[PDB]
UniProtKB/Swiss-Prot annotation, chains A, B:
Domain notes: The core domain contains the D-x(n)-D-x(35)-E motif, named for the phylogenetically conserved glutamic acid and aspartic acid residues and the invariant 35 amino acid spacing between the second and third acidic residues. Each acidic residue of the D,D(35)E motif is independently essential for the 3'-processing and strand transfer activities of purified integrase protein.
Cofactor: Mg(2+); Mn(2+)
Residues the entry annotates as binding Mg(2+) 3: 17, 74, 110
Subunit and interaction comment: Homodimer; further associates as a homooctamer.
Residue span(s) of domain Integrase catalytic: 6-160
Organism: Rous sarcoma virus subgroup C (strain Prague)
Role description: Catalyzes viral DNA integration into the host chromosome, by performing a series of DNA cutting and joining reactions. This recombination event is an essential step in the viral replication cycle. Has a strong preference for using the 3'-OH at the viral DNA end as a nucleophile.
Name of the protein in its database record: Integrase
Length: 162, 162
């Protein structure tokens, strides 16, 4: 009877996309993965959008979230290249650019991209950076944005507490 | 590199639910499965909602759509019983009652239930049955409703044609 995914729990399927964020230049391409089972997000920054940038991002995401059963992406070439298909086959991860979803596409990662860019803008401005964030402060700020969205430790819709 | 699902195509995941339709009494429980990759629908009628009715329905759906990689259901007991879990393990089909979706729950099968009940009401009324459909005409009418929703062969949003 060995089938997934962790009891009756949700299946381990990720959605990944690249989004451009000039406040993070020169490594302005943010690769973002949302795990649809937990809604956890992993983001990494890249100088150019290539097949290798996608593989480097997923290598980091696997270290953080574990190996997923499948990854959903759009049809960009960094995801459909022979190189990327081989990398995913090496890890045994299924890939779809498909629609076995419940609504139009990969809404989850699109919402994540928006929340992430908003969070980076609010934190950077809080620190006094209204335009590009200085290169030496980018990593900590991106880490801070990722923490804020994942360990949202909140009352976001809760009752009084200390 | 052998991973799913049929190239870059959508993964083979189904959504299944039971819905009550008194026009089909005495076997008024309709079990409905929507394949999220193709949007095909399979419906069967049952006298009572039990674990065995769910297994009988999926046996028919597998003959029509092939064996899926996973099936998503809610937490009703006919789906979480030991009997049903064993049946799914016997076939090697993963089961989730989860949320690895892109919106709230299993909207797909809920929309399917609505379209199906509307279609049965319009066809039955067309035949002169305003209340319960006579037992001997139910199977053909349910088959007609299933055909209408799957081989929707349409211009449903298309240009002039013969």
């Amino acid at each position: 009877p060995l089938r997934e995914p962790r009891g009756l729990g949700p299946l381990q399927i990720w959605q990944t996309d690249f989004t451009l964020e000039p406040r993070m230049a020169p490594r302005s391409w943010l690769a973002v993965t949302v795990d649809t089972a937990s809604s956890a997000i992993v983001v990494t920054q890249h100088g150019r959008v290539t097949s290798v940038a996608a593989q480097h991002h997923w290598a980091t995401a696997i270290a953080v979230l574990g190996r997923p059963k499948a990854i959903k992406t759009d049809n960009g070439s960094c995801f459909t290249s022979k190189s990327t298909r081989e990398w995913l086959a090496r890890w045994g991860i299924a890939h779809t650019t498909g629609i076995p979803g419940n609504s139009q596409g990969q809404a989850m990662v699109e919402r994540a991209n928006r929340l992430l860019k908003d969070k980076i803008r609010v934190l950077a401005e809080g620190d006094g950076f209204m335009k590009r964030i200085p290169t030496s402060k980018q990593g900590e700020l991106l880490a801070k944005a990722m923490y804020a969205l994942n360990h949202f430790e909140r009352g976001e819709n809760t009752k009084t507490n200390l």
